[PDB]
Amino acid sequence: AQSVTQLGSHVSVSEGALVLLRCNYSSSVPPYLFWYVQYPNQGLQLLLKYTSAATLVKGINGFEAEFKKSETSFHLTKPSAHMSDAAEYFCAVSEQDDKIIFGKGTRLHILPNIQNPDPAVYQLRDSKSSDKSVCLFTDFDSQTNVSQSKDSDVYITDKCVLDMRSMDFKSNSAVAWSNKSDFACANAFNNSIIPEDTFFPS
Amino acid sequence: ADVTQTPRNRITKTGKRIMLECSQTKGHDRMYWYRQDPGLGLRLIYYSFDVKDINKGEISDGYSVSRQAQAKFSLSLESAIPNQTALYFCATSDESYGYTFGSGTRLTVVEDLNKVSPPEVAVFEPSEAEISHTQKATLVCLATGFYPDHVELSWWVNGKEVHSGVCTDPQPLKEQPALNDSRYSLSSRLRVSATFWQNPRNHFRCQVQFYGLSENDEWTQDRAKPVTQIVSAEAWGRAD
């Protein structure tokens, strides 16, 4: 009815740990409630819904949600976070007997389990270079975050996690680049707090 | 194959009339148009319970709709403006909240078509030091100088699309953040074993599908007409 609330546009969970995404509603009479998932550049897929039957509702992939009227909640849970769970999740509610209204969405970020981090900054060269390169900061654990550049001619991306399925191996990276004659990979990430043991090859 | 919407991707200029079309085969009374924006979820624009019947949703200003048939529900931007840039979804419902969504329309409204520009794409080969230190090898693709922000980047190894070992930035960055019509840049990584990179028979391609002008559009500049197109860059493996 009136509304549905999801707080935190972006949330984290450790790989392997319990997934819990919160949703609350405002409706005097219990509504129907829905959780949808969306992968990048894809559409909406229904995970599960409460339709006044069982209060404990089970969905695809180990997802479940309990409808709790006295705390007006319908939190989505899954036993263990897998890397493939990285997506945007939306809770939604019936309204005015004629529609579904959607929450704002929360994007779930899964922090890979890195037992042996190996932080490094590497320089990479253009495959058909006229003397062009970028810098790759990689193999740091999720206690590191990458800050935006303070130099308007140096570009720095957000950290991104890849999962090399071939070796069951996940890693974080960010990329920096510049046209500047003065630019060096040693200095590229100087506005970020990097591990003290970051590898800087010759 | 119940609910279909057209078009899938569209770039338009400010001021043009645009029509998005939703069709269904089940003949459900209830049809809906929603838009999706980052951080806001799906917001209802308009909805209809019969050919005789139209109802405003929470964000109806700048839109109109028509229920021309049990099967069809059209959404019109009367005079498109840049803040109508969004992903749009039509839906049907049965009488018990069983929704079926269409697969979406990505619409970009640009003020000035003269600023449209395809990406330049480059692949940067793995570092020798990475290879020695880790026995893995990360390629980086950079797509730069493109406008508007309406692209899809994918990786192709020996002619087959790959998803494993890939991470692409979720949003491009602005090359000139102070500018309203800044060009964009996007990066992506593909990581493979050093063994696989070191095989000179292996072929790696980064592909950017760019959405731009159509053949109908006028173009008065000397530079290439910035039509929808694919721009790639490639590298072969190497054992030095």
Numbering used by the authors:
A (entry chain A): 1 to 202
B (entry chain B): 1 to 240
Reproduce passages from the article.
The key molecular interface that enables T-cells to sense these threats is mediated by the clonally expressed T cell receptor (TCR) that classically distinguishes between self and foreign peptides. The TCR governs T-cell specificity by discriminating between self and foreign peptides presented by MHC molecules. One key feature that is likely to facilitate this level of cross-reactivity is flexibility within the TCR complementarity-determining region loops (CDR loops) that form the antigen contact zone.
We generated 12 structures of the F11 TCR, that recognizes a peptide from the influenza hemagglutinin protein (PKYVKQNTLKLAT) presented by HLA-DR*0101 (DR1-PKY), between 1.58 and 1.89 Å resolutions; 5 structures of the DR1-PKY specific HA1.7 TCR, between 2.31 and 2.98 Å resolution; and five structures of the 003 TCR, that recognizes an HIV-GAG-derived peptide (SLYNTVATL) presented by HLA-A*0201 (A2-SLY), between 1.26 and 1.37 Å resolution. Indeed, for the F11 TCR, we observed Cα backbone flexibility in the CDR2β loop, shifting by up to 3.6 Å in different structures of the same protein. In both cases, these shifts were comparable to loop movements reported in several other studies in which the unbound and pMHC-bound TCRs were compared. However, we observed several CDR loop re-organizations between structures for the HA1.7 and F11 TCRs, while all structures of the 003 TCR were identical at the level of the Cα backbone. Thus, we conclude that these loop movements represent real differences in the conformation of the CDR loops of the HA1.7 and F11 TCRs due to the intrinsic flexibility of these regions. Although this analysis is an approximation and should be treated as such, the average maximal loop motion was slightly less (6.4 Å) for the 003 TCR compared to F11 (8.7 Å) and HA1.7 (9.0 Å), consistent with the structural data demonstrating greater rigidity in the 003 TCR.
